[PDB]
Design a protein around this ligand. Structure first.
Ligand SMILES: CCOc1nc(N)nc2c1C(=O)N(C1CCCCC1)C2
Ligand SMILES: CCOc1nc(N)nc2c1C(=O)N(C1CCCCC1)C2
Ligand SMILES: N[C@@H](CCCC[NH3+])C(=O)O
Ligand SMILES: N[C@@H](CCCC[NH3+])C(=O)O
Lengths: 466, 466
């Protein structure tokens, strides 16, 4: 309803030649600056340093001859103004009262004081924008699901949304910084693709009008990233969105930000080292500690070196017998049944369902079954496994790395099989037959990263989801 | 055919327990380093500093007891190796000859010399990858259109592709740097959207399985970016892809990288200043001069201040009469006819077809007809025009800025009209009614940027197009 009483305040301000949506107002300082300038000014004393400030009016104590308002800027830094009868504008006080509701953006200019709390005594004052929707109190405890459909109000009423948003951006800057120190180069590769590949997932397709063909949004950059290595890039990354056309859950969203990373002349040994350094480095730049605090109240130490275990062995110890690349599916399905399609899937599942689940501290698992890794090189010695690792951080499948399958005729097979469950990406292959040097790739969910570091849910790490 | 003679060299190397696709090789240095280490080593003299280098074998002069090869790394830095009978491996020379074709990646380790040109005399040597497709000579002048379908070979054979790729990335780093100095913050906003808006264009749609609705790839971030400003961001950007579902040409591609930028408490006056500083700053970091050289041989000075002209006036002078917001379409269509749907479109077209075309040096045009600018504020004084500018750099429509339409009921109209040519983005509106402060937005084609700076075509600025 009060939506109505508001629309009229605008209407009636238009009529008078008052401006409820100016083009400019001369804000000199943000409130953070007003504060940083004057840390310990003796309270109830005046300094004559003039400023033009603006921001959001949340507190309001309409008080006869003299009003009081909390200005909060968009960062959340709070200042109070004192709208007075005396130091100009009687009718200012009349307009002020009658015109200024809550959530309204409001410039005021004058001299900076403190009082019985830091405030500015206004020579001038003006509206800068006029809300026609009052801010929910916040208790009115906006549900998680309505905070996401209206993030802009969450950002205004809920301090933590401010922190999180800012954090995600700190993390991302930290990551670009980390990889640029190491001489990596950020490339842009296509989001629309004639056949999407680089991972196992159902793409989004869409129709073109230029070409009159369908096109596929990228599930992953890997394949084009590899073309760059062929093309002579030594070290490259890309940080940007992928799209996988499937259902949501606490570690899954259909569109999400994803880091991938190639570095020529190293192996999954080398790329797990970098990976861990990247994450330790990130956490510092952006959280300021490697003892990460969680809601819980507990602390998750990500400091020092991290364990590495092997899939087959580490599984073997857990099921109380030797499992190898050799173990038949009938055998495995039995064991599957004993607990609750084919070999590789059974290994990873049994692993995940016994070992993986039961990890706590940070762990790489490595040496994976070939069947489920059609892009990663075969292990250098151990037969039947590929040079790949997952990284499980606080229980979350954060990241993965490979010694990369650079051999074209092998690679042709890997896909020829896959299919049987039939056109492959024939240019991709062609590019390997030009000659891709020894490289190791990785990738990492920025969202899982934030979760694994903070405990936050996936629908809090992203600014705008649905 | 020689595709055949190659596949067998691999096959027969597998059999012998030679490795044509190792996991690792101990490259210590890139060739750039070998060079930077030893600038002026007296030619034909040996220094005993050991190195492990690798890279691409392009020159090959099989020479009896002693061979000669040009190694080129992926950056293009060239070194020569000397595969000798004497300092190890007779059979090395036999394998070397029989096994090493052109384009093949090849590690060699030893002591660094110069000779009758900088080279390394190999203690060890090994293959690291084996091409099953020989590199076109380059003349064989790969057509523009086949260089794009096979960029990875262009990157290898054509030095300029190396420069361009590297340049695009220098530009982008320069831009992020420029905006981070100014206290801007890079946000990520959704690429999938329930209704795409922020610009005039036909979206790409795609079907979801989670929701079973269609979704729209973003034509533009503007609308979500504006929600962030509401939400209290002071200064934000985003640099990332948009998708517009239409035909290609020399300034148009359906997917392309695009910068947008909001800054609260300034106007299109303020955002053209920043815009020009950004571009001057970019050109320096990344081209090293503001006198930009073009194929031509000519130079395009982007230094010093830049002209600003108004649409209506500047048009008026060109057609030899007063044109204003007032001039009817019948009048305008006549003038259209005299040369070769409605008001605003006629203005911009006549303008573009008289004034715009005939510019050379860098120019902002400003004060646009309202009809074609449904998101930008109405001018502060001049009635019938909006506070917006285009930037024409070397004849190219590079960029645009607005004093932003922050008024919700006005804004509702703007769209209600549009439609008549009927569901609007009702959340977007809602967000304005929460109160968006005075801000000014811009945006800029990274691709047009590169073109306008270099003369290069759009299908050369992007790593992978089609
Ligand atoms: C925020 C949701 O992240 C993801 N969503 C989906 N839908 N699928 C995946 C992730 C994610 O982070 N994944 C990868 C990231 C690369 C390494 C392995 C996990 C898969
Ligand atoms: C590389 C192609 O760039 C573009 N392609 C299409 N298809 N449409 C546009 C551009 C481009 O740069 N545009 C804008 C950029 C923002 C300011 C105005 C021009 C429109
Ligand atoms: N494409 C992989 C990430 C990179 C792994 C190493 N090449 C994935 O989607 O999981
Ligand atoms: N959305 C605009 C770019 C930003 C203009 C200022 N808000 C466009 O697509 O041209």
């Amino acid at each position: 309803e009060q939506f109505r009483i508001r629309r009229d305040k605008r209407a009636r301000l238009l009529a008078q030649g008052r401006d409820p949506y100016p083009v400019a107002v001369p804000r000199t300082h943000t409130l953070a600056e007003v504060r940083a300038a004057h840390p310990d000014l003796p309270i109830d004393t005046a300094t004559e340093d003039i400023v033009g400030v603006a921001g959001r009016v949340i507190f309001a104590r309409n008080s006869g001859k003299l009003c009081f308002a909390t200005l909060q800027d968009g960062d959340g830094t709070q200042l109070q103004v004192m709208i007075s009868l005396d130091k100009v504008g009687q009718a200012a006080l009349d307009a002020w009262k009658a015109d200024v509701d809550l959530g309204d953006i409001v410039y005021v200019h004058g001299a900076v004081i403190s009082s019985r709390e830091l405030s500015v005594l206004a020579d001038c004052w003006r509206i800068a924008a006029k809300s026609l929707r009052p801010l929910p109190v916040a208790h009115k405890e906006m549900s998680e699901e309505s905070r996401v459909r209206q993030r802009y109000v969450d950002l205004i009423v809920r301090p933590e949304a401010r922190a999180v948003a800012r954090l995600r951006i700190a993390v991302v800057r930290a990551i670009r910084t980390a990889l640029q120190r190491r001489g990596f180069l950020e490339v842009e590769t296509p989001v629309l693709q004639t056949l999407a590949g680089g991972a196992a997932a159902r793409p989004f397709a869409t129709h073109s009008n230029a070409l009159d063909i369908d096109l596929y949004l990228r599930i992953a950059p890997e394949l084009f990233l590899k073309r760059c290595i062929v093309g002579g890039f030594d070290k490259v990354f890309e940080l940007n969105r992928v799209f996988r056309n499937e259902g949501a859950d606490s570690t899954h969203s259909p569109e999400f930000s994803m880091l991938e990373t190639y570095q020529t002349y190293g192996t999954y040994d080398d790329s797990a080292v970098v990976t861990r350094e990247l994450i330790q480095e990130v956490a510092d730049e952006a959280i300021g500690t490697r003892q990460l605090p969680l809601p819980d109240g507990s602390v998750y130490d990500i400091d020092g070196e991290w364990a590495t275990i092997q899939m087959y062995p580490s599984l073997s110890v857990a099921l109380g017998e030797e499992i190898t690349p050799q173990t038949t599916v009938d055998r495995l399905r039995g064991i599957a049944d004993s607990l609750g399609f084919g070999h590789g899937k059974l290994i990873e599942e049994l692993w995940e369902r016994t070992v993986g689940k039961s990890l706590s501290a940070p762990t790489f698992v490595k040496d994976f079954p070939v069947q489920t890794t059609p892009l990663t090189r075969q292990h250098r010695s151990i037969p039947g496994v590929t040079e790949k690792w997952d990284l499980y951080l606080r229980g979350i499948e954060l990241a993965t790395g490979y010694s990369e399958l650079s051999d074209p005729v092998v690679q042709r097979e890997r896909f020829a099989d896959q299919a049987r469950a039939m056109v492959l990406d024939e240019d991709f292959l062609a590019a390997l037959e030009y000659g891709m040097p020894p490289c190791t790739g990785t990738g990492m969910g920025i969202d899982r990263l934030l979760m694994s570091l903070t405990g936050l849910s996936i629908r809090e790490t992203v600014l705008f989801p649905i």
